[PDB]
Design a protein around this ligand. Structure first.
Ligand code: ATP
Ligand code: ATP
Lengths: 9, 551, 570
């Protein structure tokens, strides 16, 4: 598994 | 299609009054992209400088340009999200208010047919899904598209032979991302169906437990809920297997292109056509150009869902209401003659099913009128037609020798009031609920209305007098007190034609009748709806109602 | 608590194999930064092409063998956590259905709805997703720190001093920003409750010309958000500044110390590239673990509501064990007195005593209220009597088996609820075995529903939706009557059978009641307001005030000129 950073606004 | 083109231009016209914020936000977008793309170019130039002398005229220039663009990229990216979060909030509050104003003027047949579950999703969740179009989905798509071109602009400057091998494996990365995003949305839709299917099994068992225990089917409903979970569990495992298979493909492919360029790039550098500085600037770009293609394909998939979630709202807002033309007639002479002339009504939701069959009667202002009939005859439909809530299919309703749809909307409902069959109490205070819909009133009239309707006796039991807060839906007071509040809500308005619809409500109809004879004054028309004949008498006339026909 | 969260014990062989594959995958993943520092030292001092080939094939195998072991490790864990979540969710449904009947009246259905449907599914799916991420990055955060010590201690130690000094300001401002983000989401959802409250009562709003007033009330809630929204938008810009600046300032701090060290000849330039590449991967493993941990702490905080619901004990007595082969059908009341335990201060029923026998019909009549339908509730073991004794064939009701008793006692409710299923199974609800096709036809024959159900386009397989939309009140009575006739009950309860029945099925009701050949093995208790069936009843009792007032047969009671004489003359 790998963390996916929520997209920057 | 052209249907998506109008939704393109309609969503752009929504954000027109945010022009100075978009210009300042799109400035910081361009300033940040140019700031970051030049950073790895100066990274390799420092290393190439670090093979000779430490001359100030080139080494200190490259170091200063490193910190200036690192400051320029980070400071601009902070202000880009600052001006885009404020833009999305302004769009979100604009379309919430505009939708709720347009939903409030629809005809009453719209709310009967439409479930309340759908209107809550359009108001709460779909407005958020449409305000993400310009500040988020067009922000990321424009930022990633310019950056991808900028990375390939520098790669062509470094080595035109090496940048061709990046384009060869590209069509796989676009195709693999597009396949996975198609499959993932298909599964996540099937999850939503099977989750609500399991919740439908517990829907019947918990609510109708009395029928369940009457037949001993508790182990049956456990068996059906255990089976409905096994259908969900198969789809939960299918989503995780496909997701963990895509990561393994991405990790092998990423290593594959890293070895192809470390090997072939080194062979080119030993021939003298590349320097160590230009190789380091080439490798930093290549790790970054793969991560921007994946974002670009994923976001463009999500932009189509934002438009699709913005087409449900624009269809609810643009639906034409089925209402008569508004009237401007407000005479001061309103003695209150009500005439019915062969009226026939069919419900718009269920047409060709007649309720009224040519009713005809007349109300005199100084007298009392009573309506009696069996359950389901349609007494409450006569109450609804008297307040301009519907349009009769045949005949007409005459009020002071005028059709009832020809009056002003605020003036008529301030003179023809009613008490509902099932009273509804809102979430405001007691004083705000007695004077509901009134622009201005004094505290004396509110007290006097409670005195006339026997609501002042229990209003002093609980503290703060009439400023006590009521709970939501009115679930704080007794059922008997709720009818007294509803009755006092009618009388404070000083009405002209009065309609009381207790019907199944009893044990208080004689408390009202004993003080005032159905609150008949001598110039106020009173209509009382009851189920039993032995209850009125007071009424000057009586009109029995059977299957939509008067006797 | 974590001790009560000690489930999933039966799967400890499968979870241990996962924990051996995550460490093997974490050791083989870090070969990539190791063989970039050996290549950057190979170029700086030249060498054979064998060492280039040998260093590439070890980075070939270890990176490929690290992606496969993660994929095998991932699916294993995803297979087992699917079973644990599904087994517990089905386990919490068995507990609520075994609770007492009084749980389900005063408390809202929707409160029971939330705790079962999405307070367990979304709780488990959030926890199972956030536990593996905490488990994956802890081992990578621990295996990276192991080789940092082996590489060089001087630059390793200077990381740990500057780490908590650089990870206080990002989470202090990070705490402030998420406080403002949840204040917007609460005020946005609060305004939706105001708007949907006025929309569900549109006839009341329209009749008072208050469409303008409801638009002003909504515009007041939205104007409150905009005041606090400008401060929230600034707090997003400062949070993006502090995270970016503090992250970048860390990178230049370690480069200066390493550059001074590598220019003194203490370490080669190859080892500096490995260490810097480990610095970013170790920092990312800390900031991911710092964000996951509040989410896991939130999930276990809400897990105490589920386990309290599972651990509570029912108030009703447990089911009996006796299953006799044949029942005669005799039932008697011995001075019973029932009170609702929700308000035990009020005695709904008191002083009830009558006996029922097969072949005779006993009718219960009275006014509205006065515990009419409450007598039917006590007979089919829905509540326990506060006083008196209840006897069925010489035995008390809770001594009998739960499934067998309800198969021999059938009742018709005041408003018979119907479920959305096939009507072939809806007629044969709750049976231990599926009956054949003849009995459902025979049940429709004895109920009078066959004249309508055979006219359906699908007939016995006609689907019905929720709340019985595609049926009339009279057809709802007919579908319920056949449901109580398949099992051939020894004691039959008939409450409000003809509320909306004025057709041929009413004639079949009295034919079954008074002239059918099977009445001699059945006992019928009848509660309807139609006096035509009362005058033919073998026994008629009057109910008023929750007690027996007048009794006897039919003809014995008008000669007394009692309460039965009242509504007959009326
Ligand atoms: N909102 C509605 N939508 C569709 N049909 C309706 C609606 N309200 C009433 N009807 C129909 O109108 C008839 C009865 O109308 P109404 O509610 O005025 O009767 P009532 O006798 O005054 O009421 P009650 O049911 O309280 O005795 C029935 O055929 C019913 O199905
Ligand atoms: N869950 C409950 N909590 C409190 N009181 C209840 C509850 N269920 C029923 N009651 C009350 O107890 C009595 C039970 O109703 P009852 O047996 O008298 O029915 P009924 O109205 O006479 O029936 P029918 O509609 O067939 O004429 C009623 O007075 C009712 O208000």
């Amino acid at each position: 598994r790998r963390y996916q950073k929520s997209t920057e606004l | 299609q052209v249907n998506n083109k109008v939704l393109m231009w309609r969503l752009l016209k929504l954000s027109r009054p945010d022009l100075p914020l978009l210009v300042a936000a799109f400035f910081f977008l361009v300033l940040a992209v140019l700031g970051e793309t030049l950073i790895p170019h100066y990274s390799g130039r420092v290393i190439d400088i670090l093979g000779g002398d430490f001359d100030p005229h080139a080494f200190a220039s490259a170091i200063f340009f490193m910190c200036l663009f690192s400051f320029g990229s980070s400071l601009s990216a902070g202000c880009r999200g600052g001006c885009f979060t404020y833009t999305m909030s302004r769009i979100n509050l604009r379309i919430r208010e505009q939708l709720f104003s347009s939903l409030l003027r629809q005809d009453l047949g719209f709310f009967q047919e439409t479930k309340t579950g759908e209107l809550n999703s359009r108001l709460s969740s779909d407005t958020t899904l449409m305000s993400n179009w310009l500040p988020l989905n067009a922000n990321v798509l424009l930022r990633s598209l310019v950056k991808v071109v900028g990375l390939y602009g520098f790669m062509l400057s470094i080595s035109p032979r090496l940048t061709l091998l990046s384009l060869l494996h590209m069509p796989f990365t676009i195709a693999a991302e597009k396949v996975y995003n198609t499959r993932h949305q298909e599964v996540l839709r099937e999850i939503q169906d099977a989750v609500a299917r399991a919740g439908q099994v517990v829907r019947e068992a918990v609510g109708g437990l009395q029928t369940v225990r009457s037949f001993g089917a508790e182990e049956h409903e456990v068996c059906r809920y255990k089976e409905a979970l096994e259908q969900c569990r198969q789809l939960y495992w299918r989503r995780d297997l496909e997701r963990a298979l895509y990561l393994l493909v991405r990790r092998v492919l990423h290593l594959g292109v890293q070895m192809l360029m470390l090997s072939c790039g080194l062979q080119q550098m030993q021939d003298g056509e590349l320097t160590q500085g230009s190789l380091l600037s080439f490798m930093i770009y290549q790790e970054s150009v793969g991560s921007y293609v994946q974002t670009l394909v994923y976001i463009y998939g999500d932009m189509l869902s934002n438009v699709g979630a913005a087409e449900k709202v624009f269809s609810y807002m643009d639906r034409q209401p089925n209402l008569p033309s508004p009237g401007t007639l407000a005479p001061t002479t309103l003695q209150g003659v009500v005439k019915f002339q062969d009226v026939s009504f069919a419900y718009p939701n269920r047409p060709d099913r007649p309720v009224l069959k040519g009713l005809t009667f007349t109300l005199r202002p100084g007298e009392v009128t009573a309506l009696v009939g069996p359950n389901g005859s349609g007494k409450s439909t006569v109450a609804a037609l008297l307040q301009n809530l519907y349009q009769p299919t045949g005949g007409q309703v005459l009020l002071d020798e005028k059709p009832i749809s020809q009056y002003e909307h605020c003036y008529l409902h301030s003179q023809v009031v009613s008490v509902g069959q099932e009273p509804v109490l809102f979430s405001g205070s007691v004083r705000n609920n007695i004077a509901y819909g009134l622009q201005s009133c004094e505290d004396d009239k509110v007290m006097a209305a409670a005195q006339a309707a026997h609501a002042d006796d229990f209003i002093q039991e609980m503290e703060h007098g009439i400023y006590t807060d009521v709970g939501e839906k009115g679930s704080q007071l007794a059922a008997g007190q709720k009818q007294r509040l509803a009755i006092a809500r009618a009388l404070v308005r000083d009405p002209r034609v009065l309609i009381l619809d207790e019907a199944t409500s009893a044990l208080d109809v004689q408390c009202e009748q004993a003080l005032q004879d159905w609150n008949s004054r001598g110039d106020r028309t009173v209509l009382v709806i009851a189920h039993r004949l032995q209850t009125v008498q007071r009424a000057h006339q009586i009109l029995v109602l059977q299957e939509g026909k008067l006797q | 608590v974590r001790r009560l969260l000690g489930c999933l014990g039966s799967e400890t062989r499968r979870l241990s194999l996962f924990l051996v594959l995550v460490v093997l995958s974490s050791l083989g993943e870090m070969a990539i930064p190791f063989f970039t520092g050996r290549l950057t030292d190979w170029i700086l001092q030249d060498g054979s092409a064998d060492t280039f080939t040998r260093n590439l094939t070890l980075m070939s195998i270890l990176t490929i063998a690290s992606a496969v072991l993660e994929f095998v490790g991932d699916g294993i864990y995803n297979n087992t956590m699917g079973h644990v979540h599904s087994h517990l969710q089905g386990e919490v449904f068995g507990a609520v259905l075994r609770q007492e009947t009084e749980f389900f009246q005063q408390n809202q259905t929707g409160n029971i709805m939330s705790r079962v449907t999405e307070d367990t599914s979304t709780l488990s799916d959030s926890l199972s997703e956030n536990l593996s991420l905490f488990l994956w990055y802890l081992v990578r955060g621990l295996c990276l720190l192991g080789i940092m010590l082996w590489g060089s201690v001087s630059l390793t130690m200077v990381t740990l001093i500057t780490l908590p000094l650089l990870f206080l300001l990002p989470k202090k401002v990070g705490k402030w920003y998420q406080l403002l983000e949840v204040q917007v989401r609460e005020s946005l959802a609060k305004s939706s409750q105001v708007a949907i409250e006025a929309l569900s009562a549109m006839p009341t709003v329209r009749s008072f010309a208050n469409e303008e007033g409801e638009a002003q009330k909504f515009r007041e809630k939205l104007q409150e958000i905009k005041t606090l929204n400008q401060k929230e938008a600034v707090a997003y810009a400062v949070n993006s500044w502090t995270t970016s600046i503090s992250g970048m300032l860390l990178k230049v701090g370690i480069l200066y110390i390493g550059g001074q060290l590598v220019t003194s000849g203490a370490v080669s330039s190859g080892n500096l590239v490995t260490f810097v590449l480990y610095q970013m991967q170790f920092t990312q493993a800390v900031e991911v673990l710092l964000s996951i941990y509040p989410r896991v702490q939130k999930a276990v905080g809400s897990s105490e509501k589920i386990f309290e619901y599972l651990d509570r004990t029912p108030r009703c007595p447990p089911s009996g064990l006796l299953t006799p082969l044949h029942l005669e059908g005799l039932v008697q009341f011995q001075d019973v007195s029932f009170a609702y335990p929700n308000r035990p201060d009020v005695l709904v029923l008191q002083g009830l005593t009558f006996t029922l026998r097969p072949g005779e019909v006993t009718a219960l009549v009275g006014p509205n209220g006065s515990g009419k339908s409450t007598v039917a509730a006590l007979l089919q073991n829905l509540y326990q009597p506060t006083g008196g004794q209840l006897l069925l064939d010489g035995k008390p009701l809770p001594q009998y088996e739960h499934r067998y008793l309800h198969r021999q006692v059938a009742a018709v409710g005041q408003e018979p609820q119907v479920f959305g299923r096939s009507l072939q199974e809806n007629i044969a609800y709750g049976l231990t075995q599926k009956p054949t096709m003849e009995e459902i036809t025979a049940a429709a024959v004895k109920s009078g529903a066959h004249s309508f159900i055979s006219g359906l386009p699908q007939g016995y397989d006609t689907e019905v939706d929720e709340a019985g939309s595609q049926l009339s009140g009279g057809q709802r009575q007919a579908v319920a009557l056949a449901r109580a006739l398949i099992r051939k009950p020894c004691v039959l309860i008939l409450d409000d059978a003809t509320s909306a029945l004025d057709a041929n099925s009413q004639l079949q009701v009295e034919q079954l009641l008074y002239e059918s050949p099977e009445r001699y093995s059945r006992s019928v208790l009848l509660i309807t307001q139609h006096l035509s069936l009362v005058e033919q009843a073998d026994h008629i009792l009057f109910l008023e005030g929750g007690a027996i007032r007048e009794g006897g047969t039919h003809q014995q009671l008008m000669e007394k000129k009692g309460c039965y004489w009242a509504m007959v003359q009326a």
